[PDB]
């Protein structure tokens, strides 16, 4: 694998910091005028993380159509993703409106509500079946239907109802709960096991709207997830580990949202994940059972 060759020689020369800086230097720069409007100041979690105007998701609203979210549309792979920040106490209604309007089937969450002693995300879904949530501003109802808790991730089945038309849909929530407070989980096995769980659910299928992916800012962990998935899909489409260039794929993704992949360590982990995942893509079906064991999801 030309990918694994580059990997071992970047490691050898210990130059991840420099490779990653090269990415930042070459990455696209597009305007984020709407995000920066004064009326939107309280709709942004971080002053330095904003969606580009050309790729932002627009809420179907008369008043204010803004949410901090970007459509990543990957032309060759034929897969789309919505990347967004962790919802704020005042944007949970906007978040679920987006899920409804875009026809998403799945939501992927890669952070915990509290990390490093501060609040990284609002509690935007119900924790108990009997205590449903109503978002008055967007007129939507949200109910916990069931929860399956494993050692490092939790899958929830939710029912989202448009209170206006009374139509209902099932949304699947995939919550990765074990990304370490500091520095990447540097075995990819549990990450890959999680990604394949999302794929098996049908949430990534062309028949549904784009999956919604978020962490706290919606660029680091979220970027890692989407980069690994897209690279694996490309290798699958041409069944050719060799033609896929991770750095080129990441730069393509950065055309649609800024700052994807936040550290050199996250880039190195992305390589690791793709390389290990390639084993399955190329015919070794048995490798998936190995990941599931390596990531003791029962403890």
From Swiss-Prot:
Entry binding sites for substrate: 181, 215-221, 262
Main location: endoplasmic reticulum
S-nitrosocysteine: modified positions: 215
Catalytic residues (UniProt): 215 (phosphocysteine intermediate)
E.C. number: 3.1.3.48
Modified residues (Phosphoserine): 50, 242-243
Documented effect of changing residue 50 to A/D: No phosphorylation
Annotated membrane topology: Peripheral membrane protein
Post-translational modification Phosphotyrosine, affected residues: 20, 66
Stated role: Tyrosine-protein phosphatase which acts as a regulator of endoplasmic reticulum unfolded protein response. Mediates dephosphorylation of EIF2AK3/PERK; inactivating the protein kinase activity of EIF2AK3/PERK. May play an important role in CKII- and p60c-src-induced signal transduction cascades. May regulate the EFNA5-EPHA3 signaling pathway which modulates cell reorganization and cell-cell repulsion. May also regulate the hepatocyte growth factor receptor signaling pathway through dephosphorylation of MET.
Protein name in the entry: Tyrosine-protein phosphatase non-receptor type 1
Organism of origin: Homo sapiens (Human)
Gene from which this protein is expressed: PTPN1
């Amino acid at each position: 694998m030309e990918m694994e060759k580059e990997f071992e020689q970047i490691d050898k020369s210990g130059s991840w910091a420099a490779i990653y800086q090269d990415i930042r230097h070459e990455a696209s720069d597009f305007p984020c005028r709407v995000a920066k409007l004064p009326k939107n100041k309280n709709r942004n979690r971080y002053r330095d993380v904003s969606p580009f105007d050309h790729s932002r998701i627009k809420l179907h609203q008369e008043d204010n159509d803004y949410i901090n979210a970007s459509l990543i549309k990957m032309e060759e792979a034929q897969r789309s993703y919505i990347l967004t920040q962790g919802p704020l106490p005042n944007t949970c209604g906007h978040f679920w409106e987006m899920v409804w309007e875009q026809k998403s089937r799945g939501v992927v969450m890669l952070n915990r509500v509290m990390e490093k002693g501060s609040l990284k995300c609002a509690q935007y879904w119900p924790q108990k079946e009997e205590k449903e949530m109503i978002f008055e501003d967007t007129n939507l109802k949200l109910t916990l239907i069931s929860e399956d808790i494993k050692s490092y991730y939790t899958v929830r089945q939710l029912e989202l109802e448009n209170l206006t038309t009374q139509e209902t849909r099932e949304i699947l929530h995939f919550h990765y709960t074990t990304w370490p407070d500091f520095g990447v989980p540097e075995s990819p096995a549990s990450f890959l096991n999680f990604l394949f769980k999302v794929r098996e659910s049908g949430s990534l299928s062309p028949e549904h709207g784009p999956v919604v992916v978020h962490c706290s800012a919606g660029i680091g962990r979220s970027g890692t997830f989407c980069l690994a998935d897209t690279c694996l899909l490309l290798m699958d489409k041409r069944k050719d580990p060799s033609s896929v260039d991770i750095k080129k794929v990441l730069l393509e993704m950065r055309k649609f949202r800024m700052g994807l992949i936040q550290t050199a360590d996250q880039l190195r982990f992305s390589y690791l994940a793709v390389i290990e995942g390639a084993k399955f893509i190329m015919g070794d079906s048995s490798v998936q059972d190995q990941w599931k064991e390596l990531s003791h999801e029962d403890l």
